[PDB]
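Operator note (shift B, R.M.): manual run for Malonyl CoA synthetase requested after the automated queue skipped it. Running by hand, logging everything below so the morning shift can see what happened. Input copied straight from the record, untouched. If output looks odd, do not overwrite the archive copy; leave it for review.
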Amino acid sequence: MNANLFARLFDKLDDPHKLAIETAAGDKISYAELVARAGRVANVLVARGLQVGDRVAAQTEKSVEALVLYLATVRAGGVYLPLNTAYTLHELDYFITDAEPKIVVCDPSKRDGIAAIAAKVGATVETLGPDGRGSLTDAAAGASEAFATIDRGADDLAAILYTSTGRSKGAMLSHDNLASNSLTLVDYWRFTPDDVLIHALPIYHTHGLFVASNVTLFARGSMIFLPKFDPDKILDLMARATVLMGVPTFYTRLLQSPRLTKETTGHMRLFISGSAPLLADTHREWSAKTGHAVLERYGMTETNMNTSNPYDGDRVPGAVGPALPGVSARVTDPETGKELPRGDIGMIEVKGPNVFKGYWRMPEKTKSEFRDDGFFITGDLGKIDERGYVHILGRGKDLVITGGFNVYPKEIESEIDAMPGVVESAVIGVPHADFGEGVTAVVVRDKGATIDEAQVLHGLDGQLAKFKMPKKVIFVDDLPRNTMGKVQKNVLRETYKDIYK
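Run finished. Output pasted below as returned.
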């Protein structure tokens, strides 16, 4: 039947009156109520000139109404284009010009400001504020709820999400890209209609917009729709929720709370982290304080989710799990494009029903990033181990070259980080008359941890090829980090420039 994501989500409901969404104010919206809301908004969009295939660009603060706009856009056969709330009027000009949306929805504060930009591409402007009120909401109230969901095929567009070295690119995502991936995750992450997801992520990125929302809705579960992340509120809610999706900072911040215990997390079923790697130390602490594991998973705008750690059993250090059902992952020589033996490091490529359709109005870039056999070149370097787990090892800028051989610091860092007493390691290359660069590990230990330099080197023995062995292990109270909290390896290289003199 209809491949329209809205139809896949809402066509057959056994229990339409069950909770879909609890708002931050505590309002309850059933599945039936959510569908009706979407019907009213879809009627407004069509009334304002939205035709099948047109884009709706939306720069909205997070609200249930903003989520409804996404659903309504796809229902009406439109292509939903969320835009980071951080974009200035000048920055919006780029996206609106590139995408040529028919409708632009923005905060009431920008209404008159975006008028000229919108007029340039022939778009109509509506508004939606952080409270979910605005011209869109005014109009929807007076619109009919009945709407015939537009027929769409698997490969028809549902959304465009822009990426973050060149200009920002519009990733074209199909109905089946979105439906296939979240349906796969419902099963892989063992969701049921009894699940309650704490939703504290932005909805202008893949994670909060698609993964959290679509997985919950395909599962027939519900979400508690928070406007933003707040450690105390989340702790509050865990007593009556089952799932949390977050990013590492969620977990590290939560860990800083005396409130975090086995009891306060006793009701929870599943914790997931994405976007950036969790430290092994954080995995360990979370497990020690709460009794729970935290699942990690590899994904990106162009591919949705590619892998996930298994629901049951072993996390592998440095890895984010095997390819999900339906998804193919491989590692290739970055230049020649030939697949490498398992365990060798190269370019990660993925193929599957999750992979996007290309970049909007950028045919040459689209051509260059796909192999002849349909695999998408991710830009990420890494390896796939003999167990099939994917290890992401960065994007190549941090390369160390020792005795003429390439070394990827993350490969070594994950092994050291997995050792008891280790908070975090940073592997760098500094001048070494014999090897050009000497592999060097700089390690933060737990207060009073007993692990020493010899123990780290012994632990690495056998785990990695000999040429990758650090020549020295240096212990420090902390790592230098930039204002964004990223470890500064240039600073480390300056500090330790003379260690092999």
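Quick read of the result: The chain has 15 helices and 25 strands. Residues 31-47 form the longest helix (17 residues).
Leaving this for review. - R.M.
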